[PDB]
Design an enzyme around this catalytic site. Structure first.
Site, PDB file in Angstrom:
ATOM      1  CG  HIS E 221      -0.366   0.434   2.501  1.00  0.00           C
ATOM      2  ND1 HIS E 221      -0.123  -0.431   3.546  1.00  0.00           N
ATOM      3  CD2 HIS E 221      -0.016   1.667   2.944  1.00  0.00           C
ATOM      4  CE1 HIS E 221       0.346   0.249   4.578  1.00  0.00           C
ATOM      5  NE2 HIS E 221       0.419   1.525   4.241  1.00  0.00           N
ATOM      6  NE  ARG E 223       0.898   7.117   5.230  1.00  0.00           N
ATOM      7  CZ  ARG E 223       0.026   7.266   6.229  1.00  0.00           C
ATOM      8  NH1 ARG E 223      -0.247   8.476   6.715  1.00  0.00           N
ATOM      9  NH2 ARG E 223      -0.564   6.194   6.755  1.00  0.00           N
TER      10      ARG E 223
END
Lengths: 301, 301, 301, 301, 301, 301
Positions: E221, E223
């Site tokens: 994932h 950011r």
């Protein structure tokens, strides 16, 4: 409360100038540490101006005592109404006497006047001279008849040519709250009032306020109080009289027991002996017939 | 208003089933076009259920007519109280009579019962059996005597062991507002009331409600009305005595004038002749003496 | 909008199961990047469930586009009404046709049903069977005639034994606001309506809605529209008569011009030629006489 | 209500000085006890100034009667608007006549003027001279045409070169509330209005206000009232005429039944005979054709 | 904060039972006097249950310390979410390890899950299994990959078939407020992502988030962080690489500088030497060309 | 909107006196019936003063059209700001020309000025002379550079020695609401701006507003618009140019496609041929390197 609890003064100019006292100064005063031989003097808060002398701290409300809710917005109103009024009365310094601030005023009376003075429609709202008369009367600073235009309250509940009945409700007074059903009877003017009208009024009073007795503390106005309260008011008019070391007006509506009881007091009789007459005298039959007349006229007509 | 202004019914079941009437229904039938031959039948609104027979539109409030403010949240309340209630009575279908629906109901009385009922502290809040009885009485569907547990009002202004005085204040009702100044006296039990108490009470109301006269419309409960109304109630009871085609309870406190005036009407005397004894008869002296004694004892105690 | 703008479905069960579509879902698919080959499929938002096929984004309101205000609390309402409803119909999976989802729904009509339904006084509040029928009609999923119990609106402005006039006010809708000034006439029963009543009603609306013309889009219900709109509705019905690849109910009150103009279109005449008889045909005189009579009887009664 | 219900006066100076009357004085007056031969005189409240003479108590609202909501903030506005206006008109004392305060004014008219006078955009808001003209007209103190710049209401709902239609909504008046659909037609100026425009306006009026009849009470302005109200307005214009011990303007839009009915009255005919014409006369065909023209033009165009 | 700042436990049952910690408890243990030998044990408040080990008071907010605003209504929420959650996992008593209680939790991440959960439109509102997984991930008690259904935030700013961008806004959190400007990229499925889409997305964020760089802390994932922050995150990941005593997913859109800099650290290069390739490496040209194309196609379409 | 939609005038005195137009007059006008050959003239409402001539009714919002929310409190502000400003500009009647009121003004611009003028801290709040300059500029009544002290908006989002970027948010404008991400670039003064600073600013603009293109409509200020909007703004600058029957400033930050496209237009090229250049020109490499510099400097430092 003593006038000193509301205003302080200055003798610098030629006319005594009065000043209002605010809730902070009273607050600082109540907590401040003052030497005994200095409690008769107005206290200087330094940050909030002059405050009442400590000698009168007993008149202000605390978290434990009952007294002037000095913290109330009403206190600010009263304090200003007083200062204004007194400066306007403009008294000469040369004749000023300190012991005047020790004059005990009628706080609840004054509070009702504020409501009248603040009322747009109330004549006192614009009649600077009357207002000053109402206020001096209330402050026990002058001897004048509390005729209708000056009466402490304006909640009118009855009015004919000669008399005016106002309701005195203290329940909501934000200064010295008090519960007591009371009404006031004032004469519209100093004209003589024919027995004709007196009798009538007496009959009206006995019908519409049968649980009250119309009494007088000497002046030219009368209060309506619950029968369950004569006894007390009587006691009070006893200590007062025993401190003068009286003109009801002969008005037909004055409660006979009261009339006689007070009569006796003014003649030396002890209270514990005169209090008896309060419930011992029967109303005149001229008024009882006048009373039954109003009733059957209402039924029949 | 007729019971039919608040509830419609069904007969398909064993017992009669009642239904609430809503404001939209009413609004709809007031604007609907109904043929004369139908005005006396409950009106089907289609969208909002059953409305009252158009034969009663008089009863409702209009932009320029005084009537039930059915638009009120209080109408919904009463409407449901009546349905619920009637359903409990579980009256038998077979014996049902459409006429019941034409029974004139005591709307202001019911409006007061609603207040007693939503009051968690009142017995009618949880006690259903009593609730049903109080409401039936209010609806004129039962002969039962309106004792104290069933009175229309909570507002208790006096209560000794036998009687109870409650304040009837219509001035604030949402359904049919009214100014009449009245109170209601109801016995707490159908038990024989000793003369000593009857008289005490008689004296009690003379001093506490001197402007009023305790009357009776025939049942065993009383209404304190203003002397300036004594006639009206006297006339009403008369017009009632007309449609013939009265148990005063003979209570010591009932207004003497009324006592006999209503006696004269029941014997055959014309109102024109009896309306006189209403204001021409004096109370007993045992009562006067008893009332002066109240004033006296109240002055010194 | 297409039914698919409000509900998604599942076929795993015996009967089709419908689900509500939420605003976040919609918000998400409006911003998502979808390949052309997928625009016609329901869109999976992952976080907020299933959104409508991107092929319909036109239908929703954007910062600069007029559409369903799906952000409205009214969208949630309709969305759930549709799901609940459809679920009851319990249509069989085996016979399900994805096309149903492309059915254009009457959004403003449904928005009115929502009001009828949340109205405790309305029959659609508790009567579910009728509710389902009213909604199905509104969704164009059933042929049933829109009788009075099923109309889209409560606002009853008139009601005689056969007809009912309800106000269609879109001006305040949260979904698709609109200004059109219209009313709707619906029969209360599919029963034959006597000529005497037809004519009375015809006269009734001539005097009470003189600015309007009662038309029919073919079904057995009517819309009172402004004369300054008669054309528009005439054109719409025409474009509809185009896609062929009408039961006026023949009611006495239907606007004559419309009556024949729509007759001419059904025979083959071009709008250019029939649009004339819309304002060139006069009402019957039996009706004029009947309407003047209303005015007259209204002047003196 | 009589002008005395709103203002009192003084003749001390050279010009009559008027003063407002407040809700308290009226209150005290209504309760006060006044001798009969003194009810024609303004009553002195002592605490609230002068009040209307008891003779007019019937004009004020009670807990049981309908009248001037003197307690309304509107009453204070009207009372001041009047005093100001009258002092400004500055009338010479030498010519003052007591019976002027007995002039009956148009209270609802005046109330609408307040809304106009209080409106920032309304010309009367700044045109002291016009305001005085509007007000004197409303007070029935002067004979002047109520042309548009002066008309009681400014809610404009129609306006062309010659006429102006204002809506008179009393529903919300806080002084003498009233429900009645009424509109007012006033001429913008005294210019002659060609039949061309009169005819047109007449056709407009008949289409957009078909349930109303344009009538005149003699002056140079007209009211629009519901047909269901002609009968009444007629009765009223009957008593008035039977108290003169009339110029409609011939305006084409005046309701023919009214025109004829009033004609007859001014000639001795009894009302019970003339009331018939109100619903007996058919509109001119010049206006009915002009009316149908507007309609089909709206349909076709 | 450590899990022990939110929940206490019991081992009397078959599975571990967790309990919520309340603010009063916390308030109490922060003021209590605890002997050193006890600071690491859960504290018994007696009146408010079990508070966290005093060994963690650092973690809470004080009049002059930044910490968990446990006085917040949001603390109660999280506290209950954690208990409920943990209880479901039903971890076996026998295998319980007090150490779990020392697990540092992702407080701001959990605070976002709370919003997703109270959102009726979010899947975590009703889907419990997913909820438990999302929370466990947020608590660092499970290895599972944070796919899209489990991300900490709802705020969807972009979504194509493979990725989803959600806004991480801590600025308004009640627990631990923060200003960082970040977004999170999560894959919707652990499926292999075609290069064509990887690159499209890479170009997508270059034009839509040019101020940001998509990084990875090792998991699958990403950011999006401000370039003026790239270092910080680079240092953190370094200090993390220190305590040894990384699956970039190798996605085309990951910031090149980061890609290699983190490569250099994993090989053994000192931050002092690798921190350079963070701003010294250029993106591919396939990506630049792809991003200019977005701008272009956006200019003309 | 044309200046006539906001103010009316008088030529009676020696200097043209302007007057505001209120929401009521516009309202009356929009409904009033005016003869065609009279729609060019300001309309007299009689009750609300002069209104815009019917010729411009199309500029006001209705229940169906988009236009000036004349009913907005903002309209009253703008209307007064204009009247004041114009009277102050004090133009001689002798030179007055009617066609001035037909000047189309920048309504959204003016509205933002109000916010600046109403802002306590904004210099325009007290600089009567500047305000007049800002306003004349906005009214397209004078040719002057919109330097920073005069720019329509004061929401500053960037500022260095030479430039100032303000945010133009119409989203909340209560007059002509509008959604469009727009920013304005104005020069603080007319000083020459060294390439040094221009280049820098150009690099800043490209980083912090990369989705916008800085363009110019000829004057000495520039707007920042979304790339997705160049095409449109271009079209508009096309019609304008094709109505002159241009000085960007050569500023380094001006979008190259725009610069070239407009170049072509001013030379006869058709829009359908020049629109191509908008997306055809690559930014200078001097600015792209300056841009990448800002980025890596932020990463590294």
């Amino acid at each position: 409360a003593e006038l000193a609890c509301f205003v302080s003064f200055s003798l610098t100019e030629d006319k005594v100038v009065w000043y209002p006292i605010n809730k902070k100064a009273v607050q600082t005063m109540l907590c401040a540490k003052v030497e005994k031989d200095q409690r008769s003097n107005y206290y200087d808060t330094i940050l909030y101006g002059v405050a009442p002398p400590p000698e009168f701290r007993n008149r202000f409300k605390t978290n434990e005592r009952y007294g002037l809710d000095y913290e109330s917005d009403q206190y600010t109103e009263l304090v200003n109404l007083l200062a204004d009024t007194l400066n306007m009365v403009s008294m000469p310094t040369e004749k000023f006497q300190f012991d005047i601030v020790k004059t005990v005023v009628q706080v609840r009376h004054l509070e009702n006047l504020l409501c009248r003075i603040k009322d747009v429609n109330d004549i006192l709202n614009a009649n600077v001279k009357l207002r000053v008369k109402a206020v001096m009367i209330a402050c026990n600073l002058v001897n004048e008849t509390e005729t209708t235009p000056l009466t402490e309250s304006n909640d009118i509940v009855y009015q004919d040519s000669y008399f005016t009945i106002t309701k005195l409700d203290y329940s909501n007074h934000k200064l010295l709250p008090l519960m007591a059903d009371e009404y006031k009877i004032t004469i519209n003017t100093k004209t003589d009032i024919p027995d004709r009208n007196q009798t009538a009024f007496a009959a009206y009073i006995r019908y519409n306020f049968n649980k009250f007795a119309a009494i007088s503390h000497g002046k030219r106005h009368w209060r309506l109080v619950l029968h369950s309260q004569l006894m007390s008011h009587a006691e009070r008019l006893d200590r007062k009289i025993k401190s003068d070391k009286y003109d009801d007006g002969d008005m037909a509506f004055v409660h006979p027991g009261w009339k006689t009881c007070i009569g006796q007091l003014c003649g030396g009789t002890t209270f514990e002996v005169a209090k008896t007459s309060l419930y011992s005298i029967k109303p005149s039959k001229t008024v009882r017939t006048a009373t039954n007349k109003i009733e059957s006229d209402l039924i029949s007509m």
